[PDB]
Design a protein around this ligand. Structure first.
Ligand SMILES: [Zn+2]
Ligand SMILES: [Zn+2]
Lengths: 46, 126, 107, 64, 309
């Protein structure tokens, strides 16, 4: 899949490919966070 | 003197949140302004350490000398890389992608926010 | 890989030797110091931790009347084992006499 | 932020005494009787649960 | 004086006062401070337990972080018996049946459809919004399903608030319990706190009467000085000097700091061993007595290996 990004105010999973204007494709708010996926990070309990 | 068991249980544990605002036309500037964050498919520098779009993963621990962002001049294809040049161990916390004030800016601004744990070591002041 | 060193006074004197007990602290060296001082063939038994960042104790055993200091050290180890075995026995026989009155009183 | 699992001074599990302490203060106990009746007798254990600002009911309001 | 062993096997006695689940209070009459402190200091830092060491996250989309969650999981008492397990040998991240345990904390949080009209009580609005320690699925590995019953490897308390979630927000981690003593890290300590105190003796050097006995009864802790009538006057006597908190409030009073001799009784300790629940407190004290013996065995073994003759 492409990398999911999340808008700050309306929360739509927008898939920003590397060649477009960055904006949310529902409301148009410009700050867009990045979605956390499954990968293994090992933390010690100390 | 601080009790060591009490330190190990959570006495004055904290964090410190470094946040680096990265732009690819205010800092890096050669020509044509076509610098978007991106990877070339098959780069050994960024293999399984950065995501498929050039930014790091979220929750990914970073150390000194790890890949930190990789961006792609679209005119030729010559993807660069930049390395994490800080001492302390940091965890990538959230990554916000910022456009310009209109909403038609190209994918060249980002602001990586990073946790650094920073517990009481010896030499920290109360 | 061993965890006891013995440091003589002058390479010849065997009455004074400072036992370096690796991987200990004041848990053992305060109770060894209690037992060896109950031996009348000891002029001096004291201990010190070398530095708190380290993990060993120095144990000066200093014997009068012509004995090596391995014998008050061995006697003070067995004589502490024979304290703990007896404390273990009178503790496992008073837990049992407490469970055998909690249960067999009204139940 | 959230209640610590153990008291800092002595390692007593006090991390299970936050909901059953709000439940005693909502049911009209005084705090000098809602800590003895949870079995917190030392003033380092009482300290952890008396002076605790549970600052995650204020921090989850900013949620996606 | 020398060490008469039959003076120790004649004037030593353990008097258990109160023992229940996860607590113990007893005496040790006739033992000096250097062995009593050794028992206390082996209960706190040398009797070993099992505790969470490695955490393997995937999608911690929670407000409680990836680091504070791992530290918070490490401080959770795990009800596996330590003596069945070995120390994990060093430099081995992957574990086997002998060394490690594994759990899994997989909790998603989703909105509640039913029973949610015009209310705001959070239990009625969300499902799985308080990640408690009863959400830890034990994932048995190797052949540990046969050594242990169904439902023995377990967190001790099952009511500990790990995190607090909202919809969308997820915890999906995997843990690795290891064995250690309470000197490597204090999440391994099996005791709340183990401590001793001497037994007080309060001695009335002068017969108190009348209005001073009720004054004397409030200078000590409630329970110590009873004030009962003996032919018209209210005399005072000692009764349970064990209860006295030794606060010395009678030495603030000028008329009655000459009618008590508040001191202690030599070598009459009162322990108190409160467990965190991993082991009962009568096996923690026995496995604290049996570690001082092993520390004494190891050095005699070293001396036997050093001298040959
Ligand atoms: Zn939007
Ligand atoms: Zn406490």
């Amino acid at each position: 899949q492409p990398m999911i990004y999340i808008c700050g105010e309306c929360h739509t999973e927008n898939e920003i490919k590397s060649r477009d204007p960055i904006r949310c494709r529902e409301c148009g708010y410009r700050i867009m966070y990045k979605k956390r996926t499954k990968r293994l990070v090992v933390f010690d309990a100390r | 003197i601080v009790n060591k068991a009490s330190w190990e249980r959570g006495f004055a544990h904290g964090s410190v949140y470094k946040s680096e605002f990265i732009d690819l036309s205010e800092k890096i500037k050669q020509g044509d302004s076509s610098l978007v964050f991106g990877i070339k498919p098959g780069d050994p520098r960024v293999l399984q350490k950065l995501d498929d779009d050039g930014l790091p993963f979220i929750g990914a621990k970073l150390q000194y000398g790890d890949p930190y962002y990789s961006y792609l001049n679209l005119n030729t294809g010559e993807s660069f890389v930049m390395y994490y040049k800080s001492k302390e161990n940091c965890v990538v916390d959230n990554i916000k992608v910022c456009s310009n004030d209109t909403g038609s800016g190209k994918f060249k601004c980002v602001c990586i926010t990073m946790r650094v744990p920073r517990n009481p070591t010896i030499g920290d002041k109360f | 890989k061993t965890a006891l060193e013995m440091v003589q006074a002058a390479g010849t004197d065997r009455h004074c030797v400072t036992f370096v007990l690796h991987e200990e602290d004041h848990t053992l060296g305060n109770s060894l110091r209690y037992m060896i001082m109950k031996n009348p063939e000891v002029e001096f038994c004291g201990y010190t931790t070398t530095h708190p960042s380290e993990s060993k104790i120095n144990l000066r055993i200093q014997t009068r009347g012509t004995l090596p200091a391995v014998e008050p050290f061995q006697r003070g180890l067995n004589e502490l084992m024979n304290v703990c075995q007896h404390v273990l026995d009178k503790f496992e026989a008073s837990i049992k006499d407490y469970k055998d009155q909690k249960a067999s009183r009204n139940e | 932020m959230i209640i610590p699992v153990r008291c800092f001074t002595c390692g007593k599990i006090v991390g299970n005494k936050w909901e059953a302490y709000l439940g005693l203060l909502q049911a009209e106990y005084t705090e000098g009787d809602a800590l003895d009746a949870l079995g917190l007798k030392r003033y380092c254990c009482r300290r952890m649960l008396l002076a605790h600002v549970d600052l995650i009911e204020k921090l989850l309001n900013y949620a996606p | 004086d020398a060490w008469d062993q039959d003076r120790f096997e004649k004037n030593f006695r353990v008097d258990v006062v109160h023992m229940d689940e996860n607590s113990l209070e007893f005496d040790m009459v006739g033992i000096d401070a250097a062995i009593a402190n050794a028992f206390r200091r082996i209960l706190l830092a040398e009797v070993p337990t099992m505790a969470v060491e490695k955490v393997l996250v995937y999608n911690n989309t929670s407000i409680v972080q990836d680091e504070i969650l791992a530290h918070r999981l490490g401080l959770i008492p795990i009800h596996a018996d330590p003596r069945l397990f070995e120390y994990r040998n060093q430099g081995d991240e992957e574990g086997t049946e002998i060394d490690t345990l594994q759990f899994r904390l997989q909790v998603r949080c989703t909105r509640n459809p039913h029973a949610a009209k015009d209310s705001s009580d959070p239990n009625e609005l969300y499902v799985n919004h308080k990640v408690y320690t009863r959400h830890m699925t034990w994932i048995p590995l190797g052949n540990q399903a046969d050594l242990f019953p169904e439902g023995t490897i377990r967190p001790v308390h099952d009511d500990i608030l790990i995190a607090q979630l909202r919809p969308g927000q997820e915890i999906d981690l995997l843990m690795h319990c290891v064995k250690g003593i309470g000197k490597d890290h204090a999440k391994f300590s099996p005791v709340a706190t183990a401590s001793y105190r001497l037994l007080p003796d309060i001695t009335l050097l002068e017969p108190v009467e009348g209005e001073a006995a009720e004054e004397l009864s409030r200078c000590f802790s409630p329970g110590v000085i009873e004030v009962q009538e003996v032919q018209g006057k209210k005399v005072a006597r000692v009764a349970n000097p064990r209860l006295d908190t030794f606060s010395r409030e009678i030495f603030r009073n000028e008329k009655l700091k000459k009618v008590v001799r508040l001191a202690r009784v030599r070598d009459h300790y009162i322990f108190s061993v409160e467990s965190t629940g991993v082991l009962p407190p009568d096996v923690l004290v026995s496995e604290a007595i049996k570690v001082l013996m092993g520390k004494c065995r190891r050095f005699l073994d070293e001396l036997d290996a050093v001298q040959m003759d």
